From a paper:
Through a systems-based approach, here we show that the symbiont Bacteroides uniformis deploys a single, exemplar polysaccharide utilization locus (PUL) to access yeast β(1,3)-glucan, brown seaweed β(1,3)-glucan (laminarin), and cereal mixed-linkage β(1,3)/β(1,4)-glucan. As exemplified by the β(1,3)-glucan utilization loci (1,3GULs) elucidated here, PULs encode concerted molecular systems of surface glycan binding proteins (SGBPs), carbohydrate-active enzymes (CAZymes), TonB-dependent transporters (TBDTs), and sensor/regulators to recognize, capture, import, and saccharify individual substrates. (ii) BuGH158 is a strictly specific, retaining endo-β(1,3)glucanase with a triose phosphate isomerase (TIM) barrel fold. Whereas BuGH158 is a highly specific laminarinase, BuGH16 is a generalist endo-β(1,3)-glucanase that can accommodate backbone β(1,4)-glucosyl linkages (as in MLG) and long/frequent β(1,6)-glucosyl branches (as in EbLam and yBG).
BuGH158 consists of an N-terminal (α/β)8 TIM barrel domain and a C-terminal, eight-stranded immunoglobulin (Ig)-like domain in contact with helices α7 and α8 of the TIM barrel. A Dali structure similarity search returned members of clan GH-A as the top 20 structural homologs, confirming the bioinformatics prediction that GH158 constitutes an evolutionarily distinct family within this clan. Additionally, a conserved asparagine (N136) precedes the general acid/base (E137) and is anticipated to engage in hydrogen-bonding interactions with the substrate. The active-site cleft surrounding the catalytic sidechains is rich in surface-exposed aromatic residues oriented to engage in stacking interactions with the substrate.
Residue numbers in the entry:
A (entry chain B): 25 to 31, 34 to 351, 356 to 429
B (entry chain A): 23 to 353, 357 to 429
The structure:
């Protein structure tokens, strides 16, 4: 009894109206569950990998939106060999998992429209696979996931009426999502299957084009505001999967990472949770928190902020300070400004460290850089409860 | 001396195929390999495939007289490198590949993983398994080279040196500036030969930007110069470098439709482009062949709106006509004009980006000028495509803001 009904729309699971409070992927689902998440999304997996996902979900009392990988090689959608292989794969998945009560929904493809070409053969095949799944599995929802793409919503409406809902991946500003969906030919409910904080293309940047990263306090506000204004306020939206519930290099080690790094050499961080995790507990539970992270109000070098275009003479001492609203510990690290960025790929190497990491008991740090260049000073503020708060400041060293 | 061998040279290293010294003049992927071969390319690189997909790649390569660096897909789920179930599955798959293709004359090299170090964790278990897979391949396949591909990563070069001495070479994927590649490899613990398994033109993080943060895109003439300069200074000049795979030999949305695309778009609704080659393809023919070209693309010198350039922060009042002009070095050109919104949905821990929305309709003209108006305030980019009648297209664009 997984049903989407007109109210916009409401989702019910065996009579029980449920909002999908999700994370992208399977990192620290213990913390997701402790934070009041009830779901996670995966992109793919064979039978054995999906059984593992659904056992993890069961341990955490969470629902799964389980992805099925579709090709971006557009010519394959005319190929009966490819289509026969995919029908055999989807038959097996539907037959195996139709009675699993952790599984919520099948995701048939992720952004199939951003393939070699957006073509009717691909959309027709999504609709064929949806019919195939619904002929075997009467329990679960069937969906596809698209980019934030008016054409793709129109395509779903035209070619895939058998879908129960559409997932939309939203990167960057979210203020127009409601209007974009409302204006499209698509009638029905949706989920925001990827969303997150302010992009490095949305923020201010220094004169040398370093994007100015929000403090963890600013990021907390952005996660809560985006959730409240653009997810839970949209009556056509049934829920969402937040990113990045984990850590990955993305312009900086902290940019969209809701956890800090773990097991980086000579960096004594252990993957602590952040105010961005606090933000999601607050909006998922709708309740105030007992434990909150240190509130970072800002950060300076020689009294100047990121927006001031901080320039330091090579070989001169500079003094940093982080302002926090008192068993606190401070971890300080200088990296080069990132120069190897995802350029048609997802993965970026960690920028090179200058000198050594420092730990202090006070909110101040002084050092010296001999090499002219573009740098970033990162501070991590550790309480003794497993929270870490963050800020960084880009600066230039000059001869 | 039959098969593929890397030898110490007086300076650096050299690669021989059946005793003939051969430079690897490669493209990433399998798009328009007819044009790659016509341009002087002798190689392409793939990331994965089953036996049947690899047979198709090697048949395409044979038809074009090209060599393949064939990838084997390795996991970024780092805990799996401890799991005998994952490792026995990969050993079986790699044994089958090595046995199936050991005598193929189109295959050059196996690429054991792409950026394994950028998975969940960079760990000994992963590098030791790459070494184990390399020894397994070389136990069966005496003809081909074995490699791994890393990000542009001093730490990864040190890990290959410590854990994977059975590799013949390392592939490095290089995005952004290339001037430090030589010193980075030289300063590393890695001692052997390398290939640049991804390289391309100027990143949108490297260029000037407008006052509203729109990256200023090079003209196709500036991109031509960048591809030629990077190849000549950093690839062919590096005596430890055995060759390279250029990107993007194809088209993909990356901030703009044109940013790193060496071909323009094909079958976009109400846009009459047909995947024409560009001055960036001409650049690779010039450096691959070392010979001057019979046919060259139109040389775009610049682009204006109302006499102003991209660097001038062009601002136009809503509901007013403006006049664009594209300057071309004079030599029956056609001009295709399109206004898109400045991209706001970018790759954010993903690769794929939707095409930004079109304002109004595409225009085609016989003259190098175009007039239109935008009624909605916002950030836009005007694109021009300059078609000769030989199958080349040249490009420029200009970001502009429409204000109340």
């Amino acid at each position: 009894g997984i049903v989407i009904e007109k109210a916009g729309y409401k989702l019910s699971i065996d009579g029980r109206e449920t909002y999908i409070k999700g994370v992208g992927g399977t990192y620290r689902l213990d913390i997701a569950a402790q934070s009041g998440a009830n779901a996670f999304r995966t992109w793919g997996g064979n039978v054995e990998e999906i059984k593992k996902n659904l056992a993890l979900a069961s341990e955490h009392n969470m629902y799964v939106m389980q992805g099925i990988g579709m090709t971006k090689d557009s010519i394959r959608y005319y190929d009966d060999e490819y289509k026969n292989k995919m029908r055999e794969e989807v038959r097996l998945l539907a037959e195996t998992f139709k009675n699993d009560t952790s599984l919520l929904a099948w995701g048939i493809g992720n952004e199939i429209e951003l393939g070699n070409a957006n073509i009717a053969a691909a959309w027709n095949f999504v609709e064929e696979l949806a019919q195939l799944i619904k002929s075997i599995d009467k329990r679960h929802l069937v969906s596809t996931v698209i980019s934030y793409n008016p054409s793709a919503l129109d395509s779903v409406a035209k070619y895939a009426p058998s879908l129960d809902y559409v997932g939309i991946n939203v990167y960057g500003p979210m203020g127009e999502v409601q209007a974009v969906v409302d204006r499209s030919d698509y009638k029905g409910a949706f989920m925001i299957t990827e969303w997150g904080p302010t992009g490095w293309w949305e923020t201010a940047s220094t004169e040398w084009k370093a994007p100015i990263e929000q403090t963890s306090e600013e990021k907390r506000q952005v996660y809560e505001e985006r959730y409240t204004q653009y997810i839970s306020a949209n009556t056509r939206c049934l829920g969402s999967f937040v990113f990045l519930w984990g850590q990955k290099e993305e312009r900086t080690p902290t940019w969209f990472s809701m956890f800090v790094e773990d097991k980086v050499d000579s960096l004594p961080l252990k993957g602590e949770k952040t105010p961005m995790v606090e933000a999601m507990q607050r909006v998922w539970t709708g309740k105030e928190l007992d434990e909150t992270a240190p509130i970072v109000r800002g950060m300076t070098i020689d009294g100047k902020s990121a927006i001031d275009n901080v320039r330091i003479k090579a070989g001169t001492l500079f003094k940093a300070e982080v302002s926090v609203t008192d068993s606190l510990a401070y971890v300080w690290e200088v990296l080069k400004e990132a120069t190897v960025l995802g350029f048609g790929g997802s993965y970026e190497p960690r920028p090179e460290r200058m000198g050594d990491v420092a730990v202090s008991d006070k909110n101040v740090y002084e050092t010296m850089i001999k090499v002219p260049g573009e740098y970033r000073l990162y501070v991590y503020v550790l309480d003794n409860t497993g929270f870490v708060s963050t800020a960084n400041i880009p600066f230039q060293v000059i001869d």
